[PDB]
Amino acid sequence: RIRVFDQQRAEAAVRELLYAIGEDPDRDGLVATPSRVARSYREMFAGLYTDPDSVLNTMFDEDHDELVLVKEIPMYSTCEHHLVAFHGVAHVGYIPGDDGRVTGLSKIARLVDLYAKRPQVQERLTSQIADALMKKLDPRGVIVVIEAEHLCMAMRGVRKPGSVTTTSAVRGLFKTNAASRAEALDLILR
Amino acid sequence: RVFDQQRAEAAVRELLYAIGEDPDRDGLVATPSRVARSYREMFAGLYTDPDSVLNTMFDEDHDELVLVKEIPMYSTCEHHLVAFHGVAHVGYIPGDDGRVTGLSKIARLVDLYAKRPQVQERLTSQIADALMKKLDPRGVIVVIEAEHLCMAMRGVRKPGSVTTTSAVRGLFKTNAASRAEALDLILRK
Amino acid sequence: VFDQQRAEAAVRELLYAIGEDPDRDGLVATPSRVARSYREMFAGLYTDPDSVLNTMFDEDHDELVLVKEIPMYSTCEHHLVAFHGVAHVGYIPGDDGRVTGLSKIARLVDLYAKRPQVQERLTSQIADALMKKLDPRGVIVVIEAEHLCMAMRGVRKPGSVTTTSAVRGLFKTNAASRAEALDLILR
Amino acid sequence: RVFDQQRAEAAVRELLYAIGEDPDRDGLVATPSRVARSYREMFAGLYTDPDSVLNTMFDEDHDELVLVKEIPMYSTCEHHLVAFHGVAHVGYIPGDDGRVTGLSKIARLVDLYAKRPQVQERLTSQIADALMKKLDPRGVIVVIEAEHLCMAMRGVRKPGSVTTTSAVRGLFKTNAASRAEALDLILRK
Amino acid sequence: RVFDQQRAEAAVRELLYAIGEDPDRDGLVATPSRVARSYREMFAGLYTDPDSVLNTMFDEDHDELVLVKEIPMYSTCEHHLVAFHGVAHVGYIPGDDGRVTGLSKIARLVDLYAKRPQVQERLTSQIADALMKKLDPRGVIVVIEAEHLCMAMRGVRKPGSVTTTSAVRGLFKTNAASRAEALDLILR
Amino acid sequence: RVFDQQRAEAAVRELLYAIGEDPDRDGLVATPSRVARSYREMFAGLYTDPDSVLNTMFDEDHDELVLVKEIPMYSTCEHHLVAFHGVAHVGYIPGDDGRVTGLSKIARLVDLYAKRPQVQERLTSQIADALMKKLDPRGVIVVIEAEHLCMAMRGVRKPGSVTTTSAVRGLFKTNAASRAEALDLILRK
Amino acid sequence: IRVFDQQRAEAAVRELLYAIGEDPDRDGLVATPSRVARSYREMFAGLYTDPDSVLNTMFDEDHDELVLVKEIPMYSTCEHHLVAFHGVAHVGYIPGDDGRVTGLSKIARLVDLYAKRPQVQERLTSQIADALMKKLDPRGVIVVIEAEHLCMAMRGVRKPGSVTTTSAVRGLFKTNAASRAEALDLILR
Amino acid sequence: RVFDQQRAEAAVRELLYAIGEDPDRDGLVATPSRVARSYREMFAGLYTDPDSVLNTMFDEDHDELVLVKEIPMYSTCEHHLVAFHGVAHVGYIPGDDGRVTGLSKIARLVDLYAKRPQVQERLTSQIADALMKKLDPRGVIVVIEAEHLCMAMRGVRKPGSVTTTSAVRGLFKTNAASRAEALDLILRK
Amino acid sequence: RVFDQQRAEAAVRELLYAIGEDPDRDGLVATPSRVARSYREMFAGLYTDPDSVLNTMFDEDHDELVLVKEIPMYSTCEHHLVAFHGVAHVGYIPGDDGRVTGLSKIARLVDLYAKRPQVQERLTSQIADALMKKLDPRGVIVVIEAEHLCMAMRGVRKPGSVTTTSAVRGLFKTNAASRAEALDLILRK
Amino acid sequence: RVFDQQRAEAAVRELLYAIGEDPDRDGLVATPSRVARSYREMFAGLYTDPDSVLNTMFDEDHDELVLVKEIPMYSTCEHHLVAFHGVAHVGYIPGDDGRVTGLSKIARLVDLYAKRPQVQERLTSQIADALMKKLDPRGVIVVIEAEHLCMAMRGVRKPGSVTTTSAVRGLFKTNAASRAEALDLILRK
Ligand SMILES: [Cl-]
Ligand SMILES: [Cl-]
Ligand SMILES: [Cl-]
Ligand SMILES: [Zn+2]
Ligand SMILES: [Zn+2]
Ligand SMILES: [Zn+2]
Ligand SMILES: [Zn+2]
Ligand SMILES: [Zn+2]
Ligand SMILES: [Zn+2]
Ligand SMILES: [Zn+2]
Ligand SMILES: [Zn+2]
Ligand SMILES: [Zn+2]
Ligand SMILES: [Zn+2]
């Protein structure tokens, strides 16, 4: 469901937030901040305003049926519990189907970006990317791996800075075959 | 600067409405309260004076540099309220009287200056100024290596870029040879 | 406009000329597939590369913006043989802070590259377009591509990589700025 | 097969018109003729029989594997007429008669089979079959490591990706240890 | 405990005479005062309850292990009053309530238990017990790697030897696999 | 100097009461006596002259540097009575007479000067001076690499810091080339 | 007028086997005179075919920069001892204004035919360089040969595996030292 | 046996005429004599008894394996009169009598058997058998690792391939465990 | 036992005459006295009781293994009067009483037993037995890693070979797990 | 310069009495005869002329450095009759005449000069002088790296120390670059 971004409502909330935390919204470093924060939230939650699935295009690979691997996909998301960024990379691997259906690398990157640009938990994000790729490409298998840094507890000096959370999702052939998942994972780690 | 908790929660709920979400759904019904509490810690520097954390001690035996590295540094961009995080490195030359301070106290000083609406260059300069003021050392050097996320999220910069800022006071500011040597020790791991 | 029917006829005539049998199983679909490959291979002729760039502003920082390992697939205009590699684009935003998306710079490289090209012309065209759109303080473009024209013949070593660079604005006037940018790009 | 130069040139000029270019402009007047000549060498395998290049010699001393590596391999996808290029590795175990052949002669066989409208898997099998036919060896193994550009051009696969294909005949197919050993030697630099 | 300064200082000056030194020479003029201060810091754990430093916080996002490594650890052997120093590694799995604590707070807890007349095994067990009590975790593991100087001082042992001790509570005590995994992370 | 056990023990029991502990627990039942004994061995150098330990030998074959490395070194800061421990490296060039001495004797000399209320520089200078006196060599070099605990215990300095001191006498003092190489020899592991 | 006499060569080898004290009729040597004669025909094939005529005509329309050929198989025989010295050759030439170039296999055959003679390595390298100058009329030529000599290893005089390196520069490479530096660096890399 | 120099030189002059060269040219006027001298050292084993070189000595301390590695081994293929060169490894277990012999003596025995028209397998067996006869050992093991040039000369193989041969006698032949450890020891650097 | 200087010097001069040297030349005039002097130190263990050097001390802190590694070990083969030298490793588990001994005293015990006409196995057992008798530990382990020169001097063995011997007493002899662990620590340097 | 074995055995038995041993115990019964036998091989250089071992050969192809490395070297200090052992490195530049010699002969020359009562520095110079006379080379360089045990036995020096000596003749002495290059090659592993 496509949602509504209310610029003016967001800016008013941000200015109220500055008063609540004790800051002075009128000082020079914060005059434009309510506006800049609203703009950042529009981009930070862009996935709510465009359907992530619609970005993928249709193409066919007539030569090969081998694994298509996409690596080091930029991944910037926001914890839904604390509205704090967790950022890293995503790795998507799919085996084209009998029809040879494929899609552009830039299009897979945008799909990941739109699912990540929502109030998210990393496990939900990994599963959603894999499910959409299965739905749209009708591939034999899909694998998604996200390597991200969570900042919620590191900021509150509870966990070591730099810790990396890793999540994976497997569909189709990678789910049924243990050898296939193991080989795909090795390619991602190397 | 007094933290109004109810005002913060109300603003966050308004923010959830603004972005089109439903604050009453289960995944966000506790979000306004959790975000307000997080903001209390993210801006903790606004409520306690960072300079006051430092304690008084004297090292009478030594004349060498005191160097502290990989101090956790978590801050918030004042322009976008988005985190930039990394590490800080503090080096000071104790004065003739030998005044020093605990390592944990320097870490607390960095944390409190960083836990504010900040710009990285301002944060580095503030840390250097506080150490000079309180310790009266011969020299101070501060280096912050932090990852900024504001422009990376908007696909403008490559992820993982690290910004480095430095501030030099006293001996490190007046003497270029000393600044070069100190910088080498901080950068080399 | 791309005349597909004309292209398919040309490719089929070409198969006859080289001695192949166009009716063979691996070549019956080839005239249509080759025409489609040429539509994308010369896609730059149909879209203005400069038009892809968007307008954005960096309010926080003014340091170098570096974009690396941009896929670059092009075709030699003399022999219609591919040369492929990567491109590296680095620009210093101006006072206004104008910037552009990483994907938009990537598409700009692709569209200029999807033309009958010589690598040196391509490097300058990318650098010039960024200057035009961003009005930056400086721009640097480096292309590392493998040329196949003489490797296809028996004249050149396989795997040789041609490197070209173009510097604009601050990078050309300041030797330190150019030298530092190159070190990060190559490493 | 006979190469017709003028027919190829007419097709190339027709193709340049089809893509919207002007063949008469100064940067492309000579291009149709250059493309016709490049095609003469790019499909040279169609005009000379690859098998005839091999010469006759016998190894009376040893019966161990003959391995030839980093053989230049330049071919053309038959589906898209786009180059895919890399290296080939040929290893054969001489038979009882000890029949062997020169490294350069094997290189020419790979080159002539590769200079055709090809699919990499067919190319590997054809090379192995010819060595099997002519040398009557105990076994043959052929490995091709080439970079394909057809789908990388259409941003579908990662640039720089390497396709590896293999063909095993005789002893290398029947003995798993022999295949494992030969493969290990081929992959090592 | 209650610390008396002049009583310690009188003992230190008495000690210098006993060992044959001259307390009035310039190297030792200020030694009696500094030694009393050093004992105040060396036994700071006797004067503050180590358990009280921990603060209360809750992690609602995660269920994973919290691991803190290379915690500075400086202690004193109770038999010889000679320092043994190294690092401590603390790992706890938060309970259902998600209770956690700050890293600096765990570091200070280790310091105060270490700043006592100690034997390394007692130190490790005391730290593990304190974390179990305050955090109510599913499991706790403590590992201390310290260099002992008592016997190296008496030319009895090779310099540089490292003593390693471990303490496991809750999940790590009941599960052998979990203990092996947690240990592997600590030694690497 | 002489060691009065009863005076030391009375001070130690007084010290344990001063810090507030219970002497009757089993960890302190026998500690008051051991502290007197530990101080006897920790300050054993005050009771034996370090210079007398060296023995007499002559090297008739060689006149090159004699280098002894990783000599165990355990000492105590005189200001805080806290141990600083590490290694010592002693290198001397035998004189015209070819005079040399045993490694075990050099180790004991370092130990006896080290088993005192000490400052690292004074210890290094004393060892070097004693070697010059006893061996009458052409040159002597002494290097001590020790870890100091005084300020690390007070959380003021980084744990693991290594203090390095040097003393050069005779030929190593007059010649920079020989000193530079000798220093290189000591640091290499 | 040169001609290879198979029968005369075999007779000489059989006389050679008698001279060294061996029995030519034993089973391990019955076929040796014929196999050695056949090997000498291939080892001195350069005397029977003109090396220069092998080069073909081609033109590079894209670039005028250096064409570099590396790891060309090179097998030759010392004329003084009739013992093989073997290695690789590296040929680099800058095309002229006309852009003239030639095939890699053609350059390889020119090197091989000059090498397949009674040779001295430096004269071999110079002859390759001159032939490339005359045939390609390039701006410059550089040839480098890295070969292993076996003459003294056979006579237990030198360690096996030593590599003799020779170079020859013509045209632009001889006049310009900078050009030599880049090209030479390219060959050794 | 004895070496007929004049007969060898005449054979070489006939060989030069047969291959089409001019023996009277300056490079080849001295070649026949130089080749004869090379054959004298190359086939020195035919002129000296390998068995007589070993000397008599007794090992009174130990009965464990005596291992000899990296023994220079230079030989000539009897089929092509082309060198194959490498190293030999000899390990023997002294008998009950404790008989042993010098390393230089094993080196000369290896050299004399190797300095003949040889095939590597025969060479390995001959060394092992001679050691068994003379030393009264419990067991003997010989390994030769050599590079063959015969097929590399005829452009069939890449240079540098290494042939490995082994021969086991006595205990190493009867005990699989003893041979297995010894083989691992010989191959490891 | 007591060394007889004059008898030793007379024997050495007789030895120099026997080997054909000139005792009166300048490099040998003082050799008989120097050799006798070296022998007094080389066999010093025969003149002082090795067991008496160990002192008594108690470890109240720990019950772990006490491990001593790289103890200098210089001995003389009794069969050839040739040195074999290396290191010794001594590990003992103190009993409940905590009885221990100094590192320098263990070194002297090893030195005195080693400074005799010896065979390595006897030396290892003697050291282990002495430690058991004096310290009454739960267990003792002694490992000697030494290079023997007896057979290297007579060119029978490869130089650099290391002979390893071990002796286990008490707990290390009864418990294989405890012995296996101690051995692993000693071998891994 | 005869070897009087019976005289040597009598001296060894007298030596055993002198050190306090019982020559009649079973561990020393055979020692005097074993020591005399070892001495015949250990001082073999005194009985045969080292210079005569070199043979006459000529290198007509090349005049660059011939380098022989890791030559086994076992010698005895003349002052203490204690072994010092290591390796020797010999490098010579052939003259215009090209005179050279076998590697084994250089090894034999080094062995016999080393198989004497020696001081390492005389040994290095004698080897260089012998090569200078026999080969009439342009230059010679000799380097010996040996471990001395005399003072390590007397716990005066660290075990394992390596003494390095060098001798340069002719071209290597007059040209500093030639000496520097040769020295670098010798020290490189
Ligand atoms: Cl087909
Ligand atoms: Cl490869
Ligand atoms: Cl660790
Ligand atoms: Zn969160
Ligand atoms: Zn920002
Ligand atoms: Zn081209
Ligand atoms: Zn294709
Ligand atoms: Zn203790
Ligand atoms: Zn201190
Ligand atoms: Zn030659
Ligand atoms: Zn052969
Ligand atoms: Zn012996
Ligand atoms: Zn000596």
Best CA proximity match to C80, nearest among C134, C14, C138: C14
- From CA C60, how far away is CA C66, in angstroms rounded? 16
Smallest Cα distance from C35 to chain B, Å? 34
Token reading at I109: 């015990």
Contact of H96 with G48, CB cutoff 8 Å: no
Contacts of E66 (CB under 8 A, 6+ apart): A158, A159, E91, E92, E93, E94, E100
Q: What angle do CA J29, J31, J35 make, to 5 degrees?
A: 155
Contact of J124 with J73, CB cutoff 8 Å: no
J6 is catalytic: no
Best CA proximity match to J75, nearest among J65, J61, J87, J66: J87
The chain E residue lying nearest I57, using CA atoms, is: E156
Q: What's the length of chain F?
A: 189
Smallest Cα distance from E177 to chain F, Å? 33
**Cα C114 vs. chain centroid, distance in angstroms?**
6
Residue G125 CB neighbour total at 10 angstroms: 25
- From CA B21, how far away is CA B13, in angstroms rounded? 10
Instruction: Please tell me if residue A71 touches chain D, with a CB cutoff of 8 Å.
Output: yes
Contacts of C146 (CB under 8 A, 6+ apart): C83, C84, C85, C159, C160, C161, C162
Instruction: Please tell me if residue C54 touches chain A, with a CB cutoff of 8 Å.
Output: no
- From CA E100, how far away is CA E131, in angstroms rounded? 10
Token reading at I65: 């293994």
Contacts of I112 (CB under 8 A, 6+ apart): I44, I45, I48, I49, I50, I53
Render H10-39 in DSSP notation, one character per residue.
HHHHHHHHHTT--TTSTTTSSHHHHHHHHH
Q: Is B173 exposed, middle or buried (0-12, 13-18, 19+ CB in 10 A)?
A: middle
- From CA I32, how far away is CA I16, in angstroms rounded? 9
Query: Cα(D78) to centroid of ligand 7, in Å?
Result: 7
Token reading at D84: 């895919």
J78: Cα within 13 Å, side-chain hemisphere: 23
Q: What's the length of chain E?
A: 188
Report CA torsion sign: G101, G107, G113, G114: positive
Residues with CB under 5 A from ligand 7 (ion): A 63; D 77, 79-80, 150
Instruction: Please tell me if residue H72 touches chain J, with a CB cutoff of 8 Å.
Output: yes
Query: Which residue type occupies A111?
Result: L
Residue A100 CB neighbour total at 10 angstroms: 13
Tell me which chain E residues have a C-beta less than 8 angstroms from the C-beta of F19.
1, 3, 8, 39, 43, 46
Contact of E62 with E79, CB cutoff 8 Å: no
Residue J139 CB neighbour total at 10 angstroms: 24
Angle between helices E5-18 and F31-42 (to 10 degrees): 50
Active-site option among C13, C20, C40, C77: C77
Query: Cα(C2) to centroid of ligand 12, in Å?
Result: 93
Token reading at I170: 């008490």
List of chains touching A (3+ CB pairs within 8 A): B, C, D, E
Ligand nearest to the Cα of H157, by number: 11
Contacts of B149 (CB under 8 A, 6+ apart): A76, A85, A87, B82, B83, B84
- Residue G32, helix vs strand vs coil: helix
Candidates B14, B74, B155; nearest CB to A154: B74
Contact of E20 with F35, CB cutoff 8 Å: no
Q: How distant, in Å, are the alpha carbons of F120, G78, G126, H12, H156 from that of G75? A: 68, 10, 16, 21, 12
Token reading at C73: 């697939």
Active-site option among C8, C84, C146, C149: C149
- The DSSP symbol for I157 reads S
Smallest Cα distance from J57 to chain I, Å? 27
Best CA proximity match to B23, nearest among B33, B37, A37: B33
Contact of J59 with G157, CB cutoff 8 Å: yes
Report CA torsion sign: C107, C110, C114, C116: positive
Binding-site entries of A: 79, 82, 152
> What are C31's strand-pairing partners?
none
A7 is catalytic: no
- From CA H159, how far away is CA H152, in angstroms rounded? 6
- From CA E166, how far away is CA F36, in angstroms rounded? 32
The chain C residue lying nearest A43, using CA atoms, is: C56
- The DSSP symbol for G75 reads E
Tell me which chain D residues have a C-beta less than 8 angstroms from the C-beta of H157.
66-67, 103
Query: Cα(J78) to centroid of ligand 13, in Å?
Result: 7
Q: Test I103 with E155 for CB contact under 8 angstroms.
A: yes
- From CA H29, how far away is CA J29, in angstroms rounded? 67
C5 is catalytic: no
Contacts of C119 (CB under 8 A, 6+ apart): C74, C83, C143, C145, C147, C162, C164
A79 is catalytic: yes
> What are H68's strand-pairing partners?
H90
Q: Is G86 part of any known ligand binding site?
A: no
Candidates F60, F61, F66; nearest CB to J148: F61
H or E element, residue C152? helix C149-152
Contact of J180 with I97, CB cutoff 8 Å: no
> What are H180's strand-pairing partners?
none
Q: Which of 92-111 (G) contact H at CB < 8 A?
A: none
- The DSSP symbol for A46 reads G
Smallest Cα distance from D137 to chain A, Å? 32
Q: What's the length of chain H?
A: 189
- From CA G24, how far away is CA F189, in angstroms rounded? 63
Burial C35-67 (b: 16+ CB within 10 A, else e): bbbbbebbbbeeeebeebbeebebbbbeebbbb
Domains of chain J: 5-42 (1.10.286.10), 50-187 (3.30.1130.10)
Contact of B81 with B39, CB cutoff 8 Å: no
Candidates H20, H41, H81; nearest CB to G155: H41
- From CA G81, how far away is CA C62, in angstroms rounded? 72
H or E element, residue E166? strand E162-170
Say which residue the tokens 């215990």 belong to.
F153
Instruction: Please tell me if residue C41 touches chain D, with a CB cutoff of 8 Å.
Output: yes
Chain D with chain G: Cβ pairs closer than 8 A: 11
- From CA J156, how far away is CA F94, in angstroms rounded? 11
Residue F170 CB neighbour total at 10 angstroms: 19
Contact of B148 with A75, CB cutoff 8 Å: no
Bridge-based pairing state of the strands F117-118 and F66-77: parallel
Residue A57 CB neighbour total at 10 angstroms: 12
Burial E33-63 (b: 16+ CB within 10 A, else e): ebbbebbbebbbbbeeebeebbeebebebbe
Q: Test I154 with J21 for CB contact under 8 angstroms.
A: no
Tell me which chain F residues have a C-beta less than 8 angstroms from the C-beta of B57.
154, 156
List of chains touching H (3+ CB pairs within 8 A): D, G, I, J
Token reading at D183: 């493969």
- From CA F13, how far away is CA E3, in angstroms rounded? 14
Say which residue the tokens 């591509």 belong to.
C145
- From CA G73, how far away is CA G88, in angstroms rounded? 5
Best CA proximity match to F92, nearest among F139, F142, F125, F144: F139
Query: Virtual CA dihedral for J49, J53, J57, J63, nearest 10 degrees?
Result: -80
HEC readout, H72-128: EEEEEECCCCCEEEEEEEEEEECCCCCEECCHHHHHHHHHHHHCCEECHHHHHHHHH
Residue D13 CB neighbour total at 10 angstroms: 21
- Residue G18, helix vs strand vs coil: helix
Instruction: Please tell me if residue J57 touches chain H, with a CB cutoff of 8 Å.
Output: yes
Token reading at D112: 């002539």
Render D36-96 in DSSP notation, one character per residue.
HHHHHHHTGGGTS-GGGG---EE-SS--SPEEEEEEEEEEEETTT--EEEEEEEEEEE--T
Token reading at I105: 């005293």
Ligand nearest to the Cα of E188, by number: 3
Q: Is I180 exposed, middle or buried (0-12, 13-18, 19+ CB in 10 A)?
A: exposed
Token reading at C114: 């999807």
Q: Is A179 exposed, middle or buried (0-12, 13-18, 19+ CB in 10 A)?
A: exposed
- From CA A164, how far away is CA B102, in angstroms rounded? 30
Report CA torsion sign: I27, I33, I37, I40: positive
Token reading at C40: 């994308």
Residue G161 CB neighbour total at 10 angstroms: 9
Best CA proximity match to F152, nearest among E81, B61, B128: B61
Residue D22 CB neighbour total at 10 angstroms: 11
H or E element, residue C162? strand C161-169
Contact of A112 with A167, CB cutoff 8 Å: no
Candidates B151, B154, B158; nearest CB to C61: B151
Candidates H60, H66, H104; nearest CB to I157: H66
Ligand nearest to the Cα of B79, by number: 5
HEC readout, D107-120: HHHHHHHHCCEECH
Active-site positions of E read 77-80, 120, 148, 150
- Could you tell me where the beta strands, DSSP code E, fall in chain J? 57-58, 66-77, 83-93, 99-100, 117-118, 139-148, 162-170
Q: Is G151 part of any known ligand binding site?
A: yes
Q: Test I83 with J153 for CB contact under 8 angstroms.
A: yes
Q: How distant, in Å, are the alpha carbons of B141, I73, I135, I141, J33 from that of I92? A: 52, 18, 9, 6, 40
Active-site positions of H read 77-80, 120, 148, 150
Active-site positions of G read 78-81, 121, 149, 151
Query: Which residue type occupies F77?
Result: C
Q: Test J155 with F104 for CB contact under 8 angstroms.
A: yes
- Could you tell me where the beta strands, DSSP code E, fall in chain F? 57-58, 66-77, 83-93, 99-100, 117-118, 139-148, 162-170
Bridge-based pairing state of the strands H66-77 and H117-118: parallel
The chain H residue lying nearest G26, using CA atoms, is: H78
Residue H25 CB neighbour total at 10 angstroms: 12
Bridge-based pairing state of the strands F66-77 and F83-93: antiparallel
Query: Cα(D172) to centroid of ligand 2, in Å?
Result: 19
- From CA H36, how far away is CA G93, in angstroms rounded? 41
Q: What angle do CA I75, I77, I78 make, to 5 degrees?
A: 120
Contact of B154 with B109, CB cutoff 8 Å: no
Contact of G95 with G57, CB cutoff 8 Å: no
The chain I residue lying nearest E153, using CA atoms, is: I102
H or E element, residue G148? strand G140-149
